[PDB]
RNA sequence: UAACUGAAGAGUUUGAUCAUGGCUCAGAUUGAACGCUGGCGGCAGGCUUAACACAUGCAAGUCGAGCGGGGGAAGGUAGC
């Protein structure tokens, strides 16, 4: 299982006679085949931290259909002031996106990819659209199914 | 046979945060200039400013099978 830390900031939190000092911890979690997860953590101490969101990514997971190794079809997808778009690409392409939306993607198994990013570019928030846009890319056999035809009709 | 296949972000407003929004950076390119340094070859390029003023040399001649004159070389013949 293959885990990727995005992102470690620390915050700061005010209290009489000084400052509490914390740490939060993205992370995302994946397989290489098709499934996919991310979490965030909170401590006072960075391996914790880490420690906490990659449990999160653990429990929260989900599955992508690939087509071999990359996308179904070109995704738009926004969470918040973030909007990503990603493309499939042909073989020895590579992942051609940023940090944030790269490792979602190579944690879910794609290869060859093109993506932009538009807006702000929280990884948070990058990581979001990013995972509700992988989340939501459909396949030509649901596409049938829900259609009632066949996939060689479909085309 | 082929004539196309293509898109990455980062820093900075606050005791933290998210957004908005400017500024700055990482690329490619040049008829370039300057600083330090400097072996060779091939192929290219070389007043972007004063359409400012120009010494000197060269950059448009050729035809005697169109024509009349006129020159200077030799040769031959004569004499002394």
Same mark, same amino acid.
């Given at each position: ?15 009489? #006679?000084?400052? @509490?000092?914390?740490?939060?911890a993205? $992370?995302?979690? #994946? ?7 991310? #979490? ?9 931290? !880490?420690?906490?969101?990659? =449990?999160?990514?653990?429990? +929260?997971? @989900? ?8 996308? /179904?079809?070109?995704? +738009? ?9 990603? /493309? ?7 992942? !051609?996106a ?7 993607? =190579?944690?879910?198994?794609?290869? +060859?990819?093109?993506?932009?990013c ?6 948070? +928030?990058?990581?979001?659209? $990013? ?6 890319? $459909?396949?030509? =056999? ?9 996939? =060689?009709? !479909? /085309?």
């Amino acid at each position: 299982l293959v885990e990727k830390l995005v992102a470690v900031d620390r915050v700061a939190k005010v209290v009489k #006679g000084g400052r @509490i000092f914390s740490f939060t911890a993205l $992370t995302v979690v #994946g397989d290489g085949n098709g499934r996919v997860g991310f #979490g965030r953590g909170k401590a006072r101490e960075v391996p914790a931290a !880490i420690s906490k969101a990659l =449990e999160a990514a653990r429990r +929260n997971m @989900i599955t992508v259909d690939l087509a071999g190794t990359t996308l /179904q079809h070109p995704v +738009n997808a926004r969470h918040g002031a973030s909007r990503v778009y990603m /493309q499939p690409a042909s073989e020895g392409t590579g992942v !051609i996106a940023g940090g944030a939306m790269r490792a979602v993607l =190579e944690a879910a198994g794609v290869h +060859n990819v093109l993506a932009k990013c538009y807006g702000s570019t929280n990884a948070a +928030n990058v990581v979001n659209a $990013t995972f509700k846009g992988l989340r939501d890319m $459909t396949s030509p =056999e649901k596409v049938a199914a829900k259609r009632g035809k066949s996939v =060689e009709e !479909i /085309q």
